[PDB]
Amino acid sequence: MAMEDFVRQCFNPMIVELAEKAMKEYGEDPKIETNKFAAICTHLEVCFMYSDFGHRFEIIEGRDRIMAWTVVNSICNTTGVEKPKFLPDLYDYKENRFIEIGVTRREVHIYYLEKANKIEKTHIHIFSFTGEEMATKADYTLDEESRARIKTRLFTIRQEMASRSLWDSFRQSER
Numbered sequence: 001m002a003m004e005d006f007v008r009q010c011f012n013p014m015i016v017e018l019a020e021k022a023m024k025e026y027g028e029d030p031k032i033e034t035n036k037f038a039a040i041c042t043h044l045e046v047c048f049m050y051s052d053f054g055h056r057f058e059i060i061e062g063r064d065r066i067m068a069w070t071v072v073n074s075i076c077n078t079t080g081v082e083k084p085k086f087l088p089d090l091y092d093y094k095e096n097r098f099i100e101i102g103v104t105r106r107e108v109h110i111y112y113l114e115k116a117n118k119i120e121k122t123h124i125h126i127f128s129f130t131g132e133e134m135a136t137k138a139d140y141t142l143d144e145e146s147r148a149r150i151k152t153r154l155f156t157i158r159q160e161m162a163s164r165s166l167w168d169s170f171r172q173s174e175r
């Protein structure tokens with residue numbers, strides 16, 4: 001599969017490993033569920049980039065569940081903030097809130113609504129592969145440069161996928 005090859009070449013090995021381990025532990029094969037594999041890599045990378053454009057942020061996504069819940073409980077005890085029912089992706093020590101991050105092949109408002117419906121006062125920030133984004137109360141958290149880097153990376157993934165005739169498949173597999 002070109003899609004499998006694509007993932008191993010455009011994402012750094014730690015992201016690939018993490019994505020692979022996550023999938024294999026739940027009995028899903030990345031050579032079969034290849035569009036899922038790429039989406040998980042893409043989401044992971046956006047979480048890591050967002051964290052790097054701050055020690056403003058604590059990365060929760062990409063840890064195993066013990067560590068993620070350990071990080072969340074330690075943040076809840078020492079700030080007073082409410083425990084989420086689901087692990088979010090980051091904590092913002094400046095604004096003193098958890099963040100859920102979304103990356104969508106469809107319209108940002110549509111995906112924003114789905115996330116909001118699955119959730120507390122977790123802040124939501126959605127990115128598209130088109131440079132559109134949406135966030136709770138239109139508070140975009142990061143400065144424009146950091147946001148522009150994420151969008152560029154996301155647009156570039158799309159374009160790479162399009163080069164290899166993978167983007168049409170990838171687009172229609174979110175649902």
Ligand SMILES: Cc1cc(=O)c(O)cn1-c1ccc(-c2nnn[nH]2)cc1
Pocket residue numbers: 035036039040043061088089101102103173174
């Ligand atoms: C795994 C995951 C964590 C998140 O925080 C988040 O926003 C999205 N995902 C995620 C990413 C992609 C999928 C998916 N499943 N099938 N195709 N894509 C399911 C979940």
Ligand SMILES: [Mn+2]
Pocket residue numbers: 061087088089
């Ligand atoms: Mn997550």
Ligand SMILES: [Mn+2]
Pocket residue numbers: 043089100101102
């Ligand atoms: Mn997320």
